[PDB]
Amino acid sequence: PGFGSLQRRLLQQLYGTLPTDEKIIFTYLQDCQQEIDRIIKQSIIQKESHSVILVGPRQSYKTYLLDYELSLLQQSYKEQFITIRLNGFIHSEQTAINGIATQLEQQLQKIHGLTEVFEKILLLLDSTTITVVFIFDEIDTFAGPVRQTLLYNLFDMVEHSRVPVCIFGCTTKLNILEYLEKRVKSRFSQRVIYMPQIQNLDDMVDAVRNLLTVRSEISPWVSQWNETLEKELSDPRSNLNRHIRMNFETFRSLPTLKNSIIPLVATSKNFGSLCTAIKSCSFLDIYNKNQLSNNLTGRLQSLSDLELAILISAARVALRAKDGSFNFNLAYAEYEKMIKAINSRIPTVAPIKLWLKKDVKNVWENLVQLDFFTEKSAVGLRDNATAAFYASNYQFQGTMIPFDLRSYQMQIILQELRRIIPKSNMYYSWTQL
């Protein structure tokens, strides 16, 4: 019964929504964390004006630091900062202004209980007085070839506002200083901060230690949990340590490892079960193979005999072709030819079905949907709504020409088939030309 308390405590720490007094800052992040915190405190406590962009890939803990700093400062300066949040994906170049207008009023309501828009905002702040905080995710989206009036005004307000003004930007591009136009680039304070990447296995081991340890006596098994965690992080031959090393070698986004670990803690039913699972550490293999179950090999292992034979025949035509193109007629011709060959190599007796061309249509439809084939020049999923509009307006020839003559290209080359297809398969001998 009491195991549930610790099991929930572990998950609550894992998701990261801890109280500011209980929250964790990883060691390798602390330098940039203090660099950000100094600017934030200068802008809020000491009424300075600044503009900063944070750099780093997605899931690099970039916004977590800002959230931690604001949650810290809300304890002592609750009445002295206003936060404005804008996201590049949701807010367009039009909807940003309305978002700012609504959020300013929303903050002011709980506080009290564009040539002139920004100036009137400043005048309202002056007449009601508080430091205005701007947070931007996906700066590159705002910094596109579309006119950058929003950031142009925001960075101009830094050294001209009668009210303290601070701007934080978030993006993953490294060429940010070329994304921003020369007009905007000039006005920006250019104190670019690059998030510290994990660069040693010691960094990741310490991050795991910080993340999974329990610092308070929530449960009587907290001492056992911390000790077991440190033991498994200590012995180099631990299964968990091996998996952590593999993660570090493969990809260095820590939240991926966090999300991988979450099911292990969540599924645990008892402390003994938790200890056995974390020692064996076998369920990460199951998770990883399920991550791989809908890959090319996973889809290929599920096909039927006739589907596999038609796939092999299509691959052979693609291989013989100069451009790799093929169609239904050639595929069925090769299927008939290989069935004839297989029958011929079986001696005739003195006194295998070639499926009808109509029945093979269902097999063709199955394979086209499972993405083993693709249309000659299929762009696939378009990038943006305007591209989707122009795509849906147009009528492609490949959708009009008959089912038997649509041109396709192959995704699994015959060599990959020979790697994957078991040799016990009857059609395996045709995986060679």
Binding site: Y15, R58, R85, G99, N362, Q369, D371
Partner: protein, 416 residues
Amino acid sequence: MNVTTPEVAFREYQTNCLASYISADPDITPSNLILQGYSGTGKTYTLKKYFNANPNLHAVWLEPVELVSWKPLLQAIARTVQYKLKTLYPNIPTTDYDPLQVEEPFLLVKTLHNIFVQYESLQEKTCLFLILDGFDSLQDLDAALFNKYIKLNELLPKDSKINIKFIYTMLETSFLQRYSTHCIPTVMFPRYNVDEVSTILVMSRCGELMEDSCLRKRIIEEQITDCTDDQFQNVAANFIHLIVQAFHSYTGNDIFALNDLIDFKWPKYVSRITKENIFEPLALYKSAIKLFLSTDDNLSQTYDLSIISKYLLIASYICSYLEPRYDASIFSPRYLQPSLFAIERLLAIFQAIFPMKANIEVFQNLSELHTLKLIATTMNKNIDYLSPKVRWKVNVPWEIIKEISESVHFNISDYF
């Protein structure tokens, strides 16, 4: 916090994964969750099966399949969330917001914020599992759309007592691989094995077929005396195994096509049932053989055409598959798509092969063929035949041209 788990067969790992990431406390659930699998994998089945065992979870169901574009998808979220909140907690005084006012995602965020502020008086923080089935099945779709719903709830104030916890279901793998860096919790559905498909069909569609009117007739007609429900179950079960083993290499491993084949062939198989056919299903197989020898998914002298039309369609095929080099020698690439040609070639070849001059009936038959779509043109809208830019091609396969040549006694087989 603890959530009970239904025993969904062949989805045990995914049921455990949905026991994870889904709980009463919004501090123990993620902002986004994706379940992925191709069609006929059980995701829509399994998700509803899991939610049907834990009513306390407040789930909202929507289907982009019906909602053609993104505007209906946005509006339905607000509408259904508002209605569900009224259904769950009615006593709080609230004011309605029109779901048709949601023209932008920012307006969706605004409306959600306003609604949650109206419920702020709630004692406890609670989850709101908005569910979208087949996100990639949306017909007006683009790559940039999904990020807007990935990074949504962080614009909401975290002080709100109601927290939205999105759940998505997806079909394609090429959609997931554009969003792998986000490390979104993902639960995967692989295609079932044959041993799984057969048992799924036996468990699901057995009793429904077992008591249909068609058997309600035949049981009395054959005056079966010792029949019991177990015999019914076994006789019905044998049908699914026979159809699966007969048409597995044709359908593949899809439940839908097997169900449709069973639906079509079940009355005919029942028709062959006699007094001696039950308790020996081998005889049932040995009498309904022709059901298992053809797919019978077909919807049903195939073309009855005028002689002028027949020779025009012969000449058009000759134009479409003979290289232009040979028109000056023969008369004086089957697997490939047909090449284009001009009417000037068609008229000359037709005049050279018919056993006719330029009376209106020839052109009338040609236009009839175009209206029949036995011959295609290079346009889609505002057909302008007389414009010189239009070109012609054959839309008929060789297997029909051969029969036409036989019916008109022509020898296309010797020109290639």
